[PDB]
Amino acid sequence: DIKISVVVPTYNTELEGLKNLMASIDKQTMNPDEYELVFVDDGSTTDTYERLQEFAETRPNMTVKQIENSGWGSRPRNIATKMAKGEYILYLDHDDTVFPETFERVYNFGKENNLDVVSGKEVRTNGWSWGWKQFSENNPHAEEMGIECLLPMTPHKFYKREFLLENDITFDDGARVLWEDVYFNSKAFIHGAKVGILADYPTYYWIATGSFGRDPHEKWNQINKLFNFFKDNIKEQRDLDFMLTHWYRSRVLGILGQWLLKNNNERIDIEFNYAKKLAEELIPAYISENLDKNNQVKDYLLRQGDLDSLKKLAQIDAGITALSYVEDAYFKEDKLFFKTSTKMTYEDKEDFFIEKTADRMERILPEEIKSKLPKEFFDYSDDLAEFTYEPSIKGRNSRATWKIDGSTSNVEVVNKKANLYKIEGEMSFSVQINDYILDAADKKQPWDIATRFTGLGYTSHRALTIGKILIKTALINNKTMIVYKNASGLISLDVGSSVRSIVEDSGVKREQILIDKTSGKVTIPLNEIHVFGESLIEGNAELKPVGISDADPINVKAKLIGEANKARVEVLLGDEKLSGEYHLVTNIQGKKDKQQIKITL
Amino acid sequence: KDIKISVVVPTYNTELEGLKNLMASIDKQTMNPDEYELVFVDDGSTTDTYERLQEFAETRPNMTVKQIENSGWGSRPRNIATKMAKGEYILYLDHDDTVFPETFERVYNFGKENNLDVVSGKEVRTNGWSWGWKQFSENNPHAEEMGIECLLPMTPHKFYKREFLLENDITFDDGARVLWEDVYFNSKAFIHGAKVGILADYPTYYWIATGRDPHEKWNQINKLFNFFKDNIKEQRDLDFMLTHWYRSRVLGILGQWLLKNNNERIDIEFNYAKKLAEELIPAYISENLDKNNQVKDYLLRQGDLDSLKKLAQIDAGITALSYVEDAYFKEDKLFFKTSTKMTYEDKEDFFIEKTADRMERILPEEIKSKLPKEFFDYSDDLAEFTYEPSIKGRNSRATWKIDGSTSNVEVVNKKANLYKIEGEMSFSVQINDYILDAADKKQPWDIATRFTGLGYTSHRALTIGKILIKTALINNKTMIVYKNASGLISLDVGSSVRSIVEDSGVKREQILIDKTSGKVTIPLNEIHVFGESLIEGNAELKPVGISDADPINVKAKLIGEANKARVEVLLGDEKLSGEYHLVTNIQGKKDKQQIKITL
């Protein structure tokens, strides 16, 4: 009885990525006799198929099959699905990895709620978020929210196999199309799939590694295809209007902003006319009535054919952002506290302004463009209460991103001079690092802090920064922690000495080093460090006689102790016979200090 | 004819291309060549520098070339060239520098009219936003009345009355370990009563930037301070040199220098600095200093290196970057409104803190208790802020203060008892103020701002975040203020970088083609037109459709009148029919408007 079948379409697969894929399957906590691997090679011209069979030699649950080159992964995915026999199917691409507890957590969640689709938290290499809104909390009855529950609509979810077969849900083979996973997930929801969102554990790592669509005529052929599919197949009004709104905003209106400043005039004219024709033919007017002000402006000028005004608006909007600065950062008890501030600016320089005229707060525009727009489309008066300001964290090893919960933030619209108003935010939050340590590997990792600011239609998710020097250490319940300004001026948090030495960053009270030569113990107290709870981290140290340049290191035991709000390194000389002056270098958790410690024995 | 100027150049393995540029800068001098002489002394070059100098000497009757045995530096060849010179004034020109075209005439006339022993002419350096910001601000033919400060910066690149140097036996030190020999040279000129003039309105000398032992360094520093104390007689002059050099070279290692050096060199130089302060620097000197330097003086004498290192980490990154709040052309000038604020690395605000009626430097308690209360109390310094604009010619490297600005600096309660420092400024650029040589008419100009307060000095390029491109045609000057690729404010005049047609845009539907005269008129879209302007150019035509177009060059013309600008293109002997590509080329800059016209 197989719980999970992993479908992997391969073609000229990079072997190192394939090794990492197979490794992440083997590390699954689930019993290997409870899942199967179904590999279908899509006519790889390299030696991937022979390597795939080689992997299957020592794995009885792995099936490999060769097919004539299909061109994409839709054909091999369908073939593997028909020959799969597991209760749930994960479509895993040949260059991605799975987290070690995914199979168990996803299946238990799925079986307990009789789900047809488990949308588990997906992780990407780049960016400060992925599925920020959808992966916010676990939802076993996610389909009640509508078709939005399946976003982001990647195929890297777990689908009940019997549900796919029963409604004949397959990938578009013999049809090269764009966003085939949008089609796939839409058909699943159209057929009434019971959807569950598993948000408290990263399940899939979609890795960035580095042709179809590039061409503007092919791209807008696929876009007309996607929108017609929405209009022809989605029968729920709420679901149809969400998909129309979401894809009109992101892919159609999405070229009428900064995209205009990064393309040549030939491509702009070609894609602008496609967008105007698609808006008129497929997008009802009520769709834009529920868009933000700046998108309503873009939709109005698009349907007027006013590309020149859109190009001008893009120059005006170029650079609007919200960067956060650290106002204060310190450890308290078992947590790290932050106070941050931000304000809307151009490129983190001069303030971004809105302007008050009579009883309206208006976007600042030249008179030439305001006279072409409906009065309400540049009146922000009703949107001044919709700002959000939140902190987030990202593990530099795992690439997993999380919102930091419990934050307190406020955003004010402030009159700076005359009738000009700026937008200022202040926030305070704390990090409890255990909230984000889910696999053992997470305990030794650098973490990078960011902030997410939204308002007036703009989204700015950027790394937290600070100007002044910042290095602060903590020893909290056996966790070495170092918050610091990194080389890019951004805020990082080393936990477990993955990048920095806590002894080096804390300093040493060299005049307070104690040598008990009868007990053979050298006590090295740490200078500046926040100590909470009891800690004992075992490590080692190295002694070298001063002067003897090429002397062998004398390896000895050492342990970083946190006790009664103070920290120290105890070095144990053991059975070594020592006389004279020695260089002492501590090695806690793989990081050596640079404190130039010398002791006389 | 009397020799007005002797140019003293000590050469040693001179870089050939710079030697050519040096020769050219002297040949281009507006002074008649029979009124100056070139006195070159080669310090035993291992390259063929002496051979090249003689190839110059063949075609130059006023050029003297001599080779001595290597002395290790330019001091001895300078002194030898000085005692064999015949001119009234001597300039010490290094073998890798150049002189501006009108320097000899302006300097000599200024020195001869005012009977000056030393003419300190405005010097220009490759890097930085100022040089001699204070001293080179105004012309002063009686500058020695202000004291020995009138000769700062004390480079040797001034003009000295030859007989004055010879009468007082003023020479450069040529010893085994020579450092700051120009400081001694200039100081000696002042001690012997030199009449000094500052020529500030014309760049005279380009000091070009081209491609360590702590024990020796502090030996030289002790030598320099002892020279000050033993030879300077006027107390005002002695106090100035002691203050200036104590601040810059002794206390000057007690800030950010501590973060750029290893602990061994720090301990050597700190102990040297502490001995020098104790032995040579009287206590009243530091009473003349700003609060932060009084902290440094106090902790130095206390031997408290650890507090100084911690203060350096607290101070690191303090700056004041200016943002453009408004920029526009009005009449014949370009106007700016800017804002600034003291920050750490243009991020979070720099703060001071109010306790009782004191405005205190924010410091850890451990340091505050080790310091006299007055030294971290900014209360009496909160109106000592300066905030002014400057400009730099990117080709000449010359920097100037922009005059006429209005500014205001405020100490603002941000929250609680924390106060930030905010400035605002209005100024305008009259580009005529800075065009002195013909080359200056076609040049990119870079704008900067100078902020000082609480001990800090921040002179940084003006910046803007939003896209800024504005063009103007003002009395035959094409002017484009723009956010350059580094995000800083630049002013291109004469089309040295950008095309004013491309940045102004063209009203494609107002193009007027006239077959009778063959005059294609292309009006410009957005541009500030003031006065009348007429600039010659040319255009290129290509049949739209033909692969290798084999272009047709025709004469074009950019014109401005009645607050309007247009480009008139003349095809003359026309041989054209159908759609034809047209791109203009004004002042070597061609637009990218993709103009198509069908004739």
Ligand SMILES: Cc1cn([C@H]2C[C@H](O)[C@@H](COP(=O)(O)OP(=O)(O)O[C@H]3O[C@@H](C)[C@H](O)[C@@H](O)[C@H]3O)O2)c(=O)[nH]c1=O
């Ligand atoms: C080119 C090609 C790929 N494939 C397989 C390899 C992978 O497992 C899978 C996807 O290719 P990758 O390089 O991993 O893609 P990718 O890393 O860019 O990932 C994404 O690409 C988007 C375009 C898809 O819509 C998404 O579903 C997702 O797969 O297709 C074949 O089977 N045959 C082929 O001929």
Ligand SMILES: Cc1cn([C@H]2C[C@H](O)[C@@H](COP(=O)(O)OP(=O)(O)O[C@H]3O[C@@H](C)[C@H](O)[C@@H](O)[C@H]3O)O2)c(=O)[nH]c1=O
């Ligand atoms: C090395 C050497 C140089 N010289 C000459 C070459 C130059 O004309 C002159 C100055 O050297 P430059 O390479 O131009 O250095 P430089 O470009 O660093 O110039 C400066 O150097 C500082 C140390 C001085 O204090 C300054 O007054 C200034 O001269 O010395 C000799 O005559 N003999 C030598 O052995």
Ligand SMILES: [Cl-]
């Ligand atoms: Cl530039």
Ligand SMILES: [Mg+2]
């Ligand atoms: Mg992939």
Ligand SMILES: [Mg+2]
């Ligand atoms: Mg030089």
Ligand SMILES: [Mg+2]
């Ligand atoms: Mg800033």
